[PDB]
Design a binder for this molecule. Structure first.
Ligand SMILES: O=C(O)CNC(=O)C(=O)O
Ligand SMILES: [Mg+2]
Ligand code: NI
Ligand SMILES: [Zn+2]
Length: 331
């Protein structure tokens, strides 16, 4: 069995190997990369996402989200307060202001310590989930707006033809902006490219151990657990590495830098934070190996999770017994 300790693997494809996306995902899996829940892919030196970022300040962040925490430093939830629209140029200036800028620090480890000590005492503003792409149309390799669609994968594997679309999303971050513990919708894969700026630190639980994290989360957030049998789908709960280690939960960590891809694998729980002003692009995707995870994915039906249009078909075809309850939570 490859990668039996479920370590995060780092890949350096050559320019030839970078041509065929599906083939390279299958290669990484042949080496056991999925067992970690997360892999890093460093593009070949000949590749570029686009020519320059000199022209991005005019993008609009229609609904910036202020991430307000409640709890203790290692076990907290966050809620998103909507703020007035601002441009990327306005948001970058805000990120760099004295109130929001990254503090002086020695190295990534010192910064990580400061994040977990102090996160709860601040409310950073995140420009998340903005439909769009920063890949040049002429970039043919690993262009996240030119991937094979999840609908097409389901049609090819299962023969059924469904509505829905699959497009990328932009994320503008600042110091302390936070992504809560989650798996993807329908336990899909994700791929994330850090276009520019400061790093992103990730934490991940191996898919084979995801239910250990779920059981800890039910203990740590007991009112939330009574509210919903899949409350991690709400994407609001944080648990620190120190608390994970105290409770024996297997996990790994890695820091992504600008120019690097990360892939999350089906049912790989992940969480993390941004080091300073940055911009990432991410999208969900499927492979044949995903289908069994899609069939078994948990679902929130309490109303909180609310998701895209395109998840309807996935539930309807893969989980017909659950469909009626889940759709009530959508409506
Ligand atoms: O970058 C972020 O804030 C969150 N991204 C992801 O959870 C992902 O790419 O799957
Ligand atoms: Mg612009
Ligand atoms: Ni994710
Ligand atoms: Zn719920």
């Amino acid at each position: 069995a490859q990668n039996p300790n479920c370590n995060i693997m780092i890949f350096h494809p050559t320019k030839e190997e970078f041509n065929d996306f599906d083939k390279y995902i299958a290669y990484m899996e042949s080496q056991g990369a999925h067992r970690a829940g997360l892999a890093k892919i460093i593009p070949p030196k000949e590749w570029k996402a686009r020519e320059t970022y000199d022209n991005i300040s005019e993008i609009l962040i229609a609904t910036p989200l202020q991430q307000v925490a409640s709890g203790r430093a290692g076990v907290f939830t966050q809620y998103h307060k909507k703020k007035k629209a601002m441009t990327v140029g306005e948001y970058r200036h805000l990120a760099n202001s004295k109130k929001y800028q990254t503090p002086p620090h020695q190295n990534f480890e010192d910064l990580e310590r400061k994040y977990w000590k102090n996160r709860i005492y601040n409310s950073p503003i995140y420009g998340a989930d903005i439909s769009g792409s920063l890949f040049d149309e002429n970039t043919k390799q690993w262009n996240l707006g030119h991937l094979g669609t999840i609908q097409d994968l389901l049609e090819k594997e299962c023969g059924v033809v469904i509505e829905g679309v699959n497009t990328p999303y932009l994320y503008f971050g600042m110091w302390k902006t936070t992504f809560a513990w989650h798996t993807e919708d329908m336990d899909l894969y994700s791929i994330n490219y850090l276009h520019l700026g400061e790093p992103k630190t990730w934490y991940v639980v191996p898919p084979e151990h995801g239910q250990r994290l779920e059981r800890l989360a039910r203990e740590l957030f007991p009112g939330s657990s009574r509210g919903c049998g899949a409350f991690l789908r709400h994407k609001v709960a944080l648990i620190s590495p120190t608390v994970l280690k105290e409770n024996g939960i297997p996990f790994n960590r890695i820091t992504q830098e600008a120019g690097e891809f990360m892939v999350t694998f089906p049912y790989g729980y992940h969480a993390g934070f941004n080091h300073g002003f940055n911009c990432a692009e991410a999208i969900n995707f499927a492979t044949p190996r995903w289908i069994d995870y899609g069939k078994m994915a948990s679902q929130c039906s309490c109303g909180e999770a609310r998701v895209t249009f395109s998840m309807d078909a996935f539930v309807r075809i893969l989980q017909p017994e659950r469909y009626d309850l889940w759709k009530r939570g959508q409506d």
